[PDB]
Design an enzyme around this catalytic site. Structure first.
Site, PDB file in Angstrom:
ATOM      1  N   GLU A 133      -5.489  -8.250  -0.657  1.00 44.99           N
ATOM      2  CA  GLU A 133      -5.969  -8.010   0.927  1.00 44.99           C
ATOM      3  C   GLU A 133      -7.396  -7.403   0.180  1.00 44.99           C
ATOM      4  OE1 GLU A 133      -4.167  -5.770   3.354  1.00 44.99           O
ATOM      5  OE2 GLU A 133      -2.650  -5.785   3.577  1.00 44.99           O
ATOM      6  N   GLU A 181       0.784  -1.380  -0.327  1.00 42.65           N
ATOM      7  CA  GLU A 181       0.200   0.348   0.090  1.00 42.65           C
ATOM      8  C   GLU A 181       0.770   1.458   0.307  1.00 42.65           C
ATOM      9  OE1 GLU A 181      -2.758  -0.096   3.093  1.00 42.65           O
ATOM     10  OE2 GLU A 181      -4.001  -1.732   2.407  1.00 42.65           O
TER      11      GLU A 181
END
Length: 531
Positions: free
Chosen positions: A265, A143
């Site tokens: 995710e 991320e």
């Protein structure tokens, strides 16, 4: 179908070893999970998962410049876990994780050092796993995000991410050996899914011109629903449309052009507070819908499990219903219904009750209670996709005066998971007067078999009160919490820190449809609560 696409398809479905090696602290236990055991990995494989993501945060395990040698114990542990997963014939994704916001973040004002640490890390990781099977893949950074001057996002951020992805690429490919054709996983910025970010990742992949690359994004559902705020208590049209739009973009940009996508995710955001934040039936419906639409677009997905889904002491799921829904969803669609609850008023004569099913292409084949089939006609009927529970069956299954879950009616279908109706004997819920400090305020409650969906807070003049004042519906958990085994509803310090000294009307919304009004008077650190 290319090799890299078969590889990623063969990953389906994956599981994240969350809040473990990625924990920010002295070691992987720092965030409450135990050290990884062999049995954990074995269990994940036994439950049907075909790939595992092992996030690692390295900053607290690195020596000083210029080597930044990784603590050998820590390193040999993460390696041991990887070896275990490979022995289970699992695919393994290894990354740099919270390093992203811990230090990689500050690349604009600390470029040379950031690049030097990043480089040293991927050198060491490359070297360590040089002889490891291709079923182990490397993910550049989790991320990725960078210092806002004005916003995330800014033009130079893209260039930073591309520089990181490219440096990573060349480090690994330069290592040679099994690293030469080792699949590499590259994120969009913040692993988000807006068209521009997709496009920029696409460009980077084109530039790298490599047949063994995988695009990755993350998804935690349409925000207001995912954290239960602004009144998004149900899995409704907007949450669904957000899934469709998102993965249409992802499919059209990568998968349709031969670039496989890993959803590295997924989960619901409110799970960070608790899985209790999302009503059970709406949660099930969310994940069933999501995984169906990921299947239709060949997206390999990997569940985020920070310890809250699989019980790592017992090696069984905390929520067997949830995992059964996921499991079923890997193969095909499951029927659902408007609710996983059937409400019956305790004071009222019991009558026939209709329930709207969502067959999703399946067919009802039976009902069971405690493993025994119910009687067609006498206990239940079906008209199209409307299920009817007969009054006599409800009478039989219930107990007068007993509020709460009286029984579970298990709907069985020709395909997909069973849907379970909790048969709730309810009464009108009531609240009590109380008084206390903003740091310790709880409304004594009589839930009477019912359950709180959400809570409105407005000032006496109709003005929205509390955090997120752009809506009257306060965030579940963060601002208030139903505590059923204490018979009370907490109102939090965080709620009170953002209300003025005034009268505040609360409106509690229950899943039965009942709404209860309540009033607070806040003055400094004291609050009075009246029925």
């Amino acid at each position: 179908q290319t090799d890299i696409q078969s590889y990623v398809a063969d990953m389906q479905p994956g599981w994240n070893l969350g809040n473990t090696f990625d924990a920010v602290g002295d070691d992987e236990t720092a965030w409450g999970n135990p050290r990884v055991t062999r049995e954990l990995i074995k269990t994940i494989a036994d439950e049907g998962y075909k790939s595992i993501r092992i996030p690692v945060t390295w900053e607290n395990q690195m020596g000083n410049a210029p080597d930044y040698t990784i603590n050998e114990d820590f390193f040999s542990r993460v390696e041991q876990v990887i070896d275990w997963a490979l022995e289970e014939d699992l695919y393994v994704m290894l990354n740099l994780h919270h390093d992203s916001w811990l230090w990689i973040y500050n690349m604009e004002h600390n470029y040379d050092e950031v690049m030097a640490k990043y480089t040293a890390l991927w050198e060491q990781l490359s070297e360590r796993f040089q002889g490891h099977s291709h079923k182990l893949m490397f993910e550049s950074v989790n991320e990725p995000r960078f210092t806002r001057d004005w916003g995330e996002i800014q033009e130079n951020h893209h260039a930073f991410l591309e520089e990181l992805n490219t440096a990573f690429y060349h480090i690994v490919r330069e290592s040679g050996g099994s690293n030469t054709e080792r699949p590499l996983v590259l994120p969009t910025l913040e692993t988000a899914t807006s068209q521009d970010l997709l496009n920029r990742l696409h460009q980077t992949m084109k530039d790298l011109n490599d047949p063994n690359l995988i695009a990755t994004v993350h998804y935690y559902g349409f925000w207001p629903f995912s954290v239960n705020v602004a009144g998004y208590t149900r899995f409704e049209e907007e949450t669904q449309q957000d899934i469709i739009d998102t993965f249409n973009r992802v499919h059209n940009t990568f998968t349709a052009n031969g670039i496989p996508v890993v959803l590295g995710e997924f989960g619901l955001l409110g799970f960070d507070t608790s899985t209790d934040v999302i009503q059970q039936g709406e949660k099930l419906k969310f994940f069933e819908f999501l995984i169906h639409h990921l299947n239709e677009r060949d997206v390999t997905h990997m569940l985020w499990d920070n310890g809250q889904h699989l019980n790592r002491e017992t090696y069984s799921w905390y929520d067997q219903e949830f995992h059964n829904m996921l499991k079923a969803s890997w193969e095909g669609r499951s029927a659902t219904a408007e609710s996983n609850l059937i409400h019956v008023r305790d004071g009222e004569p019991i009558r026939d009750q209709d329930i709207q099913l969502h067959l999703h292409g399946n067919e009802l084949t039976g009902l069971q209670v405690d493993g025994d089939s119910l009687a067609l006609g006498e206990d239940y009927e079906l008209a199209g996709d409307v299920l009817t529970m007969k009054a006599d069956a409800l009478t039989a299954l219930m107990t007068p005066g007993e509020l709460g879950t009286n029984a579970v009616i298990t709907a069985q279908f020709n395909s997909g998971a069973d849907w379970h109706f909790q048969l709730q004997n309810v009464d009108e819920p009531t609240l009590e007067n109380t008084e206390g400090s903003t740091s310790n305020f709880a409304i004594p409650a009589h839930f009477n078999g019912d359950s709180v969906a959400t809570m409105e807070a407005v000032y006496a003049n109709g003005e929205f009160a509390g955090p997120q004042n752009w809506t009257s519906f306060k965030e579940f958990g963060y601002t208030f919490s139903p505590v059923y085994d204490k018979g009370e509803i907490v109102i939090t310090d965080a709620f009170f820190n953002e209300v003025r000294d005034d009268d505040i009307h609360l409106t509690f919304h229950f899943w039965s449809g009942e709404m209860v009004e309540y009033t607070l008077s806040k003055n400094g650190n004291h609050v009075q609560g009246r029925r």
